């Protein structure tokens, strides 16, 4: 329903050579830049007063690394996404508070920075199978939501 | 933009609210936290059960924002410029969620305009709503 | 997906009201006048120019009758939604080449002509149940794109 | 709005482009129809395939066009006119699908201007698409 054998393959070889806790700090970094009220959830992250400050900031990559670190974990389960994260799910709806809608935007700033990552390498179809999980992680992540 | 027609289709339609609109502002809030759950995540701190006094007080604050800014419908950005600055840089609310609320706003109006809600008057009133959005989240970045 | 039960008798029950002919004629035409480009699947059906032309236009009428009789049967087979429009999804992708975002307005749009027709009675809950059940039907129609 | 140091990020990122307007423009393009594949939905009749001249001679239109919003940065509204008229009365694209391209344009940026995407630049470069994609769903309704 939805990755094809060879947009699985594709999403696992290029995964194999990403530095999970760099994609991940950068990530979660251009995320509060680029969609700065996804800041809410981390004023006691500390300074986030300008791009370079937000990029900089050890509790940004911090929580990056914890972040990407468990979205890397479920790359193994892309049959079961609902299921992997449904612990998650719950989670971030009963105790975070955290708006879905986020994971949808911080999975677009994963790609955009894989494309910046990667280059050329990170083709059409690349991404293709790319936005497939991006928007698979976010939808299992907001299932568990009520 | 909203054309002369538009304008004067909402003053109409919110004009025969009149009173309720309070009352009118809570239901939508009801409406919209049964419909899109994920809208309550914004506010844990408060009971959202049926009836709920914080959601009436809620309800009353966003339909007396929207009366003033049917009231300045000419000159609405800076009518509602201390909200933008306040959803910009406090509440943070995604900005998918404004068309939400405006959904819920609009069942909220038709549910109790049977005669008002025309074909022409719900496009003036979806747009009016959408503008009011827009407006709100501006200054987010 | 998933209505609870009492979700489901709200839908059954308030169904039972609905005169399908007449209210799909309505939300068709509301669709077309609250969404203009919408109207660009629609090139022969005659005088679209101002909504009374729209909502008096009677390929409206009779069209909007064909598709909310098709919303109709599905919901008796509200638990295999996707499998149920399955043929009619690929015939709008492949067909007719309707951009699925419709299919998501038209059913807000049913929501509005359901609370403007049904007054008080399309109560929040009610509301809520049908809010799932125009977004699986959507779904289900948007499946077999590609 | 685009502020003064958004204006400046575009014009220099987009300066970079250059000469590869069709090209990024037609992956661009590609990278839509592949990753959105309901996009496609507006070009029923069009050869899709990789490399095809059509997909390049249309994805140099809308480069082109993007060159001449940045150019005109501080009114996009009337440089964009013709192009918002067309898509409002003629096109008919629903205004999701603006997001999709303008998230495809930026991926593509992102793949070719290692140097300059930074994530201020990003910012900027997002905010201005979404700036482009407002104006030319202005006349929508
Ligand atoms: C791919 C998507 C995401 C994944 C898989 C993910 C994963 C995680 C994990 C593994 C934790 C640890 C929770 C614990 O220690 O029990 C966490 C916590 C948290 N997450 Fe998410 N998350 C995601 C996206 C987001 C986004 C976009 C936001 C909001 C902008 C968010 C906000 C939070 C917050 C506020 C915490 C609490 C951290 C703390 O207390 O220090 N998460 N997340
Ligand atoms: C029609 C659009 C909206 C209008 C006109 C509006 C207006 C307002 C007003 C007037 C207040 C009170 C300000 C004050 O106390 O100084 C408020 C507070 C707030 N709004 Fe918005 N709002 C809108 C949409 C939204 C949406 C879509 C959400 C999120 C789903 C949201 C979440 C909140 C929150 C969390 C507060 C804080 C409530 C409290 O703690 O009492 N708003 N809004
Ligand atoms: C609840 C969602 C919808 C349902 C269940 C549905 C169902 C149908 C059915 C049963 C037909 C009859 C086909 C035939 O007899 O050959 C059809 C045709 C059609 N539908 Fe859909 N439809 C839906 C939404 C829409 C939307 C939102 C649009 C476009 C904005 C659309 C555009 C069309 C067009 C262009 C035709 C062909 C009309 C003609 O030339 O006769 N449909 N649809
Ligand atoms: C950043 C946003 C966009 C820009 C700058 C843009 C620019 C253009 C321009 C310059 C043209 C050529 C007009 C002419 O021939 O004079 C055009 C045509 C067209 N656009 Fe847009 N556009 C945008 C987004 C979209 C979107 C998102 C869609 C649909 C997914 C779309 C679908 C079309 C179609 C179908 C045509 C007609 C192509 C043909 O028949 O040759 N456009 N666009």
């Given at each position: 329903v939805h990755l094809t054998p060879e947009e699985k393959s594709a999403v696992t070889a290029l995964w194999g050579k990403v530095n999970v806790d760099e994609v991940g700090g950068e990530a979660l970094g251009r995320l509060l830049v680029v969609?700065?009220?996804?800041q809410r959830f981390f004023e006691s992250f500390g300074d986030l007063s300008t791009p370079d400050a937000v990029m900089g900031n050890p509790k940004v990559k911090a929580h990056g690394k914890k972040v990407l670190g468990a979205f890397s974990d479920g790359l193994a389960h892309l049959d079961n996404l609902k299921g992997t994260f449904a612990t998650l799910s719950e989670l971030h709806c009963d105790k975070l508070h955290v708006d879905p809608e986020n994971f949808r935007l911080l999975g677009n700033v994963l790609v955009c920075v894989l494309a910046h990552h990667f280059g050329k390498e990170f083709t059409p179809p690349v991404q293709a199978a790319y936005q497939k999980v991006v928007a698979g992680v976010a939808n299992a992540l907001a299932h568990k939501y009520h | 933009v909203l054309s002369p027609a538009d304008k004067t289709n909402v003053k109409a339609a919110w004009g025969k609210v009149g009173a309720h609109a309070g009352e009118y502002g809570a239901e939508a809030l009801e409406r919209m936290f049964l419909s899109?759950?994920?809208?309550k995540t914004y506010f844990p701190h408060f009971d959202l059960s049926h009836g709920s006094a914080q959601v009436k007080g809620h309800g009353k604050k966003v339909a007396d924002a929207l009366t003033n800014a049917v009231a300045h419908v000419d000159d609405m950005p800076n009518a509602l410029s201390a909200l933008s600055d306040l959803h910009a840089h406090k509440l943070r609310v995604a900005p998918v969620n404004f068309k939400l609320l405006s959904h819920c706003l609009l069942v909220t109006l038709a549910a109790h305009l049977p005669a008002e809600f025309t074909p022409a008057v719900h496009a003036s009133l979806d747009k009016f709503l959408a503008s009011v959005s827009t407006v709100l989240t501006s200054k987010y970045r």
């Open positions: 969609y700065p009220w996804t | 899109f759950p994920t809208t």
